[PDB]
Amino acid sequence: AAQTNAPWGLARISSTSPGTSTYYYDESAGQGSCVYVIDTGIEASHPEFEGRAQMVKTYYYSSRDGNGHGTHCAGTVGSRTYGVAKKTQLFGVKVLDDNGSGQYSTIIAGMDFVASDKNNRNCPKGVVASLSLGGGYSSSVNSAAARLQSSGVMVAVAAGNNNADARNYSPASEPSVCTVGASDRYDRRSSFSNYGSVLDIFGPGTSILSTWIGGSTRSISGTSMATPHVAGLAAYLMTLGKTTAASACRYIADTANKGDLSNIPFGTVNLLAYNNYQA
């Protein structure tokens, strides 16, 4: 399949070179997989989701996304126009309030929630969780991310936006999950992207067009934007049968575009998510 004039990030994930605008992907498009977006929620009614999105949990007085960030991330995972995995099932878990803030205890409960909740969902091709959030190092937050992964969910987490070593952030610093840095359309490390040995992969993170609340669309930037590219990619590869939740991060690193990014600090992986799709 080919989607012309796609957001640059989608084109990038299916290309061996920057500077192209068509997204190429197998038509299976993550059908039969599920991706949890653990965030400010998802505006499931957005036409872009086509009835494939649903709020399944909130820790606040509403499950609505009153911010937009969660809806943006979900859009990058699996919206029809802006998504990597255009046929995945999207489940929203609102651990962040409408200001985009959340206590670590709530974030933890949301991760443990998903580890159980997948047993209440139909995801024959496998389960992914996208966590575009973080804060200072917490062993408890890392452990919750580790549990979710161990439970059989491909966990993708943002490296963080501090232009700093991700070792000091959580869940970014958890070795057992997939930590995602951000790049721009010229294959530069995004100026804000964290780096470090704890990173596993990079994805498009600067000037990313996706869904927003009020049935709208928006371009924003962050490792929050890179993460769902990787989450969507995992879901897509899982429905293709190429990998599983336990090894998807390794598979993505193994099949990534290598050595192509600029301003990658010494000791950080130079790997950019790539679907290796031959149309």
Binding site for Ca ion (CB under 5 A): 200
Q: Which residues contact 214 (CB under 8 A, 6 or more apart)?
A: 43
Q: Is 254 annotated as a binding residue?
A: no
Q: Is 40 annotated as a binding residue?
A: no
Q: Least distance to Ca ion from the beta carbon of 248, Å?
A: 11
Q: Which residues contact 271 (CB under 8 A, 6 or more apart)?
A: 200, 201, 202, 253, 256, 257, 258, 261
Q: Is 7 annotated as a binding residue?
A: no
72 assigned to active site:
no
Query: Which CB sits closer to Ca ion, 65 or 200?
Result: 200
Q: Is 260 annotated as a binding residue?
A: yes
- How many other C-beta atoms can be found within 10 angstroms of the C-beta atom of residue 144? 25
The catalytically annotated residue of 14, 46, 69, 229 is 69
The catalytically annotated residue of 33, 39, 117, 187 is 39
Query: Which CB sits closer to Ca ion, 201 or 235?
Result: 201
The catalytically annotated residue of 151, 183, 210, 224 is 224
Helix residue spans in the chain (DSSP H): 8-13, 69-78, 104-117, 139-150, 223-239, 248-254
Query: Which CB sits closer to Ca ion, 48 or 200?
Result: 200
Q: Which residues of 186-216 are buried (b: 16+ CB within 10 A; e: fewer)?
A: ebbbbebbbbbebbbbbbbbbebbbbbbeee
39 assigned to active site:
yes
Q: Least distance to Ca ion from the beta carbon of 155, Å?
A: 9
**Could you list the active site residues?**
39, 69, 224
Residue list for the binding site for Ca(2+): 16, 175, 177, 200, 260
